[PDB]
Structures are given as C-alpha cells and as structure tokens.
C-alpha cells in the first residue's frame, strides 16, 4: 500500500497512514503534528518547497527515517482548495519509498 498523508499548507503533517512505521520508521503518531521539513535534509527541504512554487512528475525527495538513514520517496500531490472567508489549501499525498534493487 502507498503511504497516504495530508499536509496543511504550511507543511504540518495533519495525517499520515500507519504504514509510516514500516517504511519510514515512525509511528503515525510520531509524525502527525510535526512538519514534513523536520524529516528532510536542507537539499530536500528546498526541493520540496520548490515543487509547490510551480507539474509533470510527482515530488521525489530523500526522507530521513527514524534510524537516521535516508530513503527515496515519490509523492503524488493533490491540492484541495476551499474558499470560505479566507482561501485555504490542503495537500493530499500518496507516497511510496523507492526501494533499492
């Protein structure tokens, strides 16, 4: 199964599915409430934030697992935009770890 997640527009993890533990080394409750950029090196922070400034491909970046080692993750992005009093945006992710062969 893909890992499913939701981010607030500011990168805070609102939701991630429980298979975060298998693939990323974190229980879903260790990640929800934290910012995605906490689990990335600087190169990857810039890579991912750049993605949202302009897409032909999913967002591919290195994630630092709980054990401090990196995995490559490919993230399919959908934005839900809702216009009420202010316009608000949520990011829906479908992610998978790109495994070494």
Whole-angstrom distance, CA of residue 93 vs CA of residue 24: 15
Contacts of 40 (CB under 8 A, 6+ apart): 48, 61, 62, 63, 64
- Give how many residues touch a second copy by CB under 8 A: 28
Nearer to a second copy, 12 or 65 (CB): 12
Q: Alpha carbon of 25 to those of 39, 70, 82: distances in Å?
A: 11, 11, 33
- Residue found by looking up tokens 């080394």 in the block: 25
Nearer to a second copy, 3 or 91 (CB): 91
Nearer to Cl ion, 29 or 89 (CB): 89
* Subset of residues 18 to 57 that bind a second copy, contact rule: CB under 8 A: 35-37, 46-49, 52-57
Taking the complex as a whole, how short is the minimal distance between the CB of residue 47 and Cl ion, in angstroms? 14
Binding residues for a second copy, rule: CB under 8 A, are: 7, 9-12, 35-37, 46-49, 52-58, 60, 74, 76, 79, 86-87, 89, 91, 94
């Amino acid at each position: 199964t893909d890992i499913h997640a939701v981010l607030a527009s500011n990168g805070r993890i609102i939701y991630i599915s429980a298979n975060s533990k298998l693939h990323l080394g974190y229980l879903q409750g260790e990640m929800i409430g934290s910012f995605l950029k906490t689990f990335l090196h600087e190169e990857d922070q810039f890579l991912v934030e750049s993605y949202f400034y302009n897409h032909l491909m999913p967002c591919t970046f290195r994630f630092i697992k709980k054990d401090h080692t990196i995995v490559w993750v490919e993230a399919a992005v959908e934005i839900v935009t809702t216009r009420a009093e202010r316009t608000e945006r949520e990011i829906i992710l479908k992610m998978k770890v790109l495994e070494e062969e």
